[PDB]
Design a protein around this motif. Structure first.
Motif, PDB file in Angstrom:
ATOM      1  N   UNK A  91      32.910  40.572  58.016  1.00 31.13           N
ATOM      2  CA  UNK A  91      31.867  41.535  57.812  1.00 31.13           C
ATOM      3  C   UNK A  91      31.809  42.048  56.383  1.00 31.13           C
ATOM      4  N   UNK A  92      32.967  42.204  55.771  1.00 36.82           N
ATOM      5  CA  UNK A  92      33.009  42.742  54.418  1.00 36.82           C
ATOM      6  C   UNK A  92      33.507  41.715  53.400  1.00 36.82           C
ATOM      7  N   UNK A  93      32.684  40.700  53.104  1.00 32.50           N
ATOM      8  CA  UNK A  93      33.168  39.645  52.231  1.00 32.50           C
ATOM      9  C   UNK A  93      33.086  40.017  50.764  1.00 32.50           C
ATOM     10  N   UNK A  94      34.165  39.748  50.041  1.00 35.46           N
ATOM     11  CA  UNK A  94      34.135  39.827  48.602  1.00 35.46           C
ATOM     12  C   UNK A  94      33.943  41.251  48.150  1.00 35.46           C
ATOM     13  N   UNK A  95      34.438  42.177  48.953  1.00 34.64           N
ATOM     14  CA  UNK A  95      34.166  43.580  48.729  1.00 34.64           C
ATOM     15  C   UNK A  95      35.211  44.279  47.861  1.00 34.64           C
ATOM     16  N   UNK A  96      34.761  44.855  46.743  1.00 31.62           N
ATOM     17  CA  UNK A  96      35.595  45.723  45.921  1.00 31.62           C
ATOM     18  C   UNK A  96      35.263  47.166  46.238  1.00 31.62           C
ATOM     19  N   UNK A  97      36.264  48.013  46.389  1.00 35.30           N
ATOM     20  CA  UNK A  97      35.971  49.396  46.670  1.00 35.30           C
ATOM     21  C   UNK A  97      36.731  50.269  45.708  1.00 35.30           C
ATOM     22  N   UNK A  98      36.040  51.120  44.956  1.00 34.91           N
ATOM     23  CA  UNK A  98      36.798  51.810  43.920  1.00 34.91           C
ATOM     24  C   UNK A  98      37.394  53.109  44.402  1.00 34.91           C
ATOM     25  N   UNK A  99      38.646  53.064  44.837  1.00 36.83           N
ATOM     26  CA  UNK A  99      39.289  54.226  45.447  1.00 36.83           C
ATOM     27  C   UNK A  99      39.852  55.165  44.392  1.00 36.83           C
ATOM     28  N   UNK A 100      39.750  54.753  43.138  1.00 42.90           N
ATOM     29  CA  UNK A 100      40.270  55.564  42.061  1.00 42.90           C
ATOM     30  C   UNK A 100      41.781  55.634  42.131  1.00 42.90           C
ATOM     31  N   UNK A 101      42.334  56.802  41.798  1.00 44.28           N
ATOM     32  CA  UNK A 101      43.783  56.937  41.678  1.00 44.28           C
ATOM     33  C   UNK A 101      44.401  56.707  43.051  1.00 44.28           C
ATOM     34  N   UNK A 102      45.553  56.041  43.077  1.00 45.94           N
ATOM     35  CA  UNK A 102      46.375  55.942  44.281  1.00 45.94           C
ATOM     36  C   UNK A 102      47.692  56.647  43.986  1.00 45.94           C
ATOM     37  N   UNK A 103      47.984  57.683  44.769  1.00 43.95           N
ATOM     38  CA  UNK A 103      49.132  58.550  44.566  1.00 43.95           C
ATOM     39  C   UNK A 103      50.090  58.302  45.718  1.00 43.95           C
ATOM     40  N   UNK A 104      51.331  58.771  45.658  1.00 46.98           N
ATOM     41  CA  UNK A 104      52.232  58.480  46.770  1.00 46.98           C
ATOM     42  C   UNK A 104      52.422  59.608  47.787  1.00 46.98           C
ATOM     43  N   UNK A 105      52.466  59.246  49.052  1.00 41.97           N
ATOM     44  CA  UNK A 105      52.434  60.240  50.099  1.00 41.97           C
ATOM     45  C   UNK A 105      53.637  60.127  51.053  1.00 41.97           C
TER      46      UNK A 105
END
Ligand code: 5GI
Length: 181
Positions: free
Chosen positions: A108-122
Motif C-alpha cells: 500500500x505504501x510503496x517507495x514512501x519517505x516520511x519525514x519524522x524529523x528528530x528521533x530521540x531516545x525513549x
C-alpha cells in the motif's frame, strides 16, 4: 541530497514489502538471507515478500539481557538471492538522530519517505500491554501499516518502526551486534 540518496539505495536494495497473517509490513534485508521484522508481524513457517511465497527457515525474537521484548524478529529467508550487507551502516550503539526520514515500502505504501524529523531516545515503552525496551521516539503522527519501516538519518540505520499513538511514533532502536552471527 546524500541523506535521501542513501535512502533510495536502501529502498532498491534492502527494503521489501511483506505480508504476514498480521498484515502489511516493511522488511529490512540486512545481509545474505537475513532480514528483520517488527516482532508483532509474527512471521510463521512462511511469509509473502512482494507477493511471492518465501520459506522461513530461522526466526529469533530479540530480548533484553534482562529478557524483555525488543519487538524485533530476525528471520532467515529461503533463497539464492543475497541481501547486500548494510550492517556497516547500523551503529555500534543505539544512537538518537538529527533529521531522520522513514523509508517504508508495503503493498500500500510503496517507495514512501516520511519525514519524522528528530528521533530521540525513549527506552522502556508499554504499548499493547506487552512492554518493550530500547525504543526511540520521533514527533510524528505515525499510522497503521507502517511498522517495520526503516529509520535513516545521514547514512545510518538506527531504527525499525514499531508503535505510535496518533501524535508520536516509536521505533525499535538497532545496534550492529544484533546481526552478528
Ligand atoms: C493506542 C495504541 C497504539 C498501539 C501500538 O502502537 N501497537 C503497535 C503494535 C505493538 C504491540 C505490542 C508491542 F509490544 C509493540 C507494538 C502497533 O500497532 N504498531 C503499528 C505497526 O504495525 C504502528 C502504529 C499503530 C498505532 C498508530 N501509530 C502506528 O505507528 N497500541 O495501542
Amino acid at each position: 541530497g546524500p541523506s535521501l540518496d542513501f535512502a533510495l539505495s536502501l529502498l532498491r536494495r534492502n527494503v521489501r514489502q511483506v505480508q504476514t497473517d498480521q498484515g502489511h509490513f516493511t522488511m529490512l534485508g540486512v545481509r545474505d538471507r537475513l532480514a528483520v521484522l517488527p516482532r508483532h508481524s509474527q512471521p510463521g513457517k512462511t511469509i509473502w515478500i512482494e507477493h511471492k511465497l518465501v520459506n522461513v527457515l530461522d526466526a529469533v525474537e530479540l530480548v533484553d539481557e534482562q529478557g524483555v521484548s525488543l519487538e524485533l524478529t530476525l528471520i532467515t529467508l529461503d533463497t539464492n538471492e543475497k541481501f547486500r550487507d548494510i550492517t556497516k551502516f547500523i551503529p555500534e550503539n543505539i544512537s538518537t538522530a538529527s533529521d531522520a526520514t522513514l523509508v517504508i515500502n508495503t503493498e500500500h505504501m510503496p517507495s514512501m519517505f516520511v519525514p519524522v524529523g528528530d528521533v530521540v531516545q525513549y527506552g522502556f515503552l508499554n504499548l499493547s500491554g506487552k512492554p518493550t525496551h530500547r525504543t526511540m521516539m520521533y514527533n510524528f503522527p505515525t499510522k497503521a501499516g507502517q511498522c517495520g519501516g526503516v529509520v535513516t538519518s545521514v547514512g545510518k540505520i538506527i531504527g525499525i518502526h514499531i508503535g505510535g499513538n496518533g501524535r508520536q511514533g516509536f521505533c525499535a532502536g538497532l545496534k550492529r551486534s544484533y546481526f552478528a552471527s
